[PDB]
Amino acid sequence: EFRVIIPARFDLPGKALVDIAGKPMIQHVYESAIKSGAEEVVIATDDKRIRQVAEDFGAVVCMTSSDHQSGTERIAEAAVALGFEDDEIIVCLQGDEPLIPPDAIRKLAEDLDEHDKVASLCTPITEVDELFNPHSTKVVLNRRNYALYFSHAPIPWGRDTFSDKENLQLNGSHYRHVGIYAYRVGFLEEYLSWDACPAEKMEALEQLRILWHGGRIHMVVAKSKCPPGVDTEEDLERVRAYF
């Protein structure tokens, strides 16, 4: 009823295989996908070392092309190689997100199925330090929970409050974006025809491409804690300290 594809990268050098409490990161990610109730979970990678490690814990791996460098290109190649029909729901779960609640993965799939193109997940920001951290991605929502914008900048900005952080309390006000999407397979062909935009390149946020091209992304707010993922060595030590 839905399938998970996990794009996993090697060049944090050796990222997908960094040890987290005994298991490589990609294994943690894979386990979250299984527990979600996905019909099938597949790891998509262009790296043979990642293939080896994932096959050795029993994962199905789709080897993708060194040409297809973005996560979504990988997903697309894998989705073609695996034979997914245009009506099938794919969850793209980034290999840098090892701590997404499995129920949230499923909820994301349900959201996209409930409504007749792309859904993604976010979580409340309650700590001022996280809001203002340029490493975190913020997302601003409209009334119906569609994304208006995604940024590293602290948005929405408190015109009269951000200059007084000691009195600043965050109360339903701000959301952090999680690296997971739900897409129908059909959408990936249209998506891949679109070129990049300046904002996506500045922010290094590929999802801005969808907004640039007049597309919409529906957001689901995770009920449960969704710890931030792992892109830096600081992130890795934080996540290792959860166990």
Q: How many residues bind a copy of itself (CB under 8 A)?
A: 35
> Is there a contact between 108 and 32 (Cβ–Cβ < 8 Å)?
no
Q: How many residues bind Ni ion (CB under 5 A)?
A: 2
Sign of the alpha-carbon dihedral angle for 41, 239, 223, 205: negative
Start-to-end Cα distance in the chain: 32
Q: How far is the CB of 167 from Ni ion (least distance, A)?
A: 4
**Contact stretch for Ni ion (CB under 5 A) within 42-50, 168-176, 198-206, 227-235:** 168-176
**How crowded is the C-beta side of 95, counted as CA atoms within 13 Å?**
28
Give the one entry of Ni ion, a copy of itself, none that residue 162 binds, where binding means its C-beta sits below a cut-off of 5 to 8 angstroms depending on kind.
Answer: a copy of itself
Distance separating alpha carbons of residues 32 and 163, to the nearest angstrom: 40
* 167 forms part of the interface with Ni ion (CB under 5 A): yes
Q: How far is the CB of 187 from Ni ion (least distance, A)?
A: 35
For residue 21, with 0-12 CB atoms within 10 Å meaning exposed, 13-18 middle and 19 or more buried, which class applies?
Answer: exposed
Instruction: Please state, in angstroms and as integers, the Cα–Cα distance from residue 160 to each residue in 27, 70, 128, 164, 165, following that order.
Output: 45, 39, 15, 8, 10
**Contact stretch for a copy of itself (CB under 8 A) within 42-50, 57-65, 96-104, 148-156:** 148-156
Question: Which of 13, 204, 241, 243 contacts a copy of itself by CB under 8 A?
Answer: 204
Q: How far is the CB of 149 from Ni ion (least distance, A)?
A: 24
Residues contacting residue 31 through CB under 8 Å, at least 6 positions apart: none
Location of structure tokens 């799939």:
109
Quick note: the x/- pattern for a copy of itself over 97-136, rule CB under 8 A, is -------------------------------------x--
* 14 forms part of the interface with a copy of itself (CB under 8 A): no
Binding site for Ni ion (CB under 5 A): 167, 169
Binding site for a copy of itself (CB under 8 A): 134, 140, 142-144, 146, 148-149, 151-163, 172-173, 197-199, 202-205, 208, 211-214
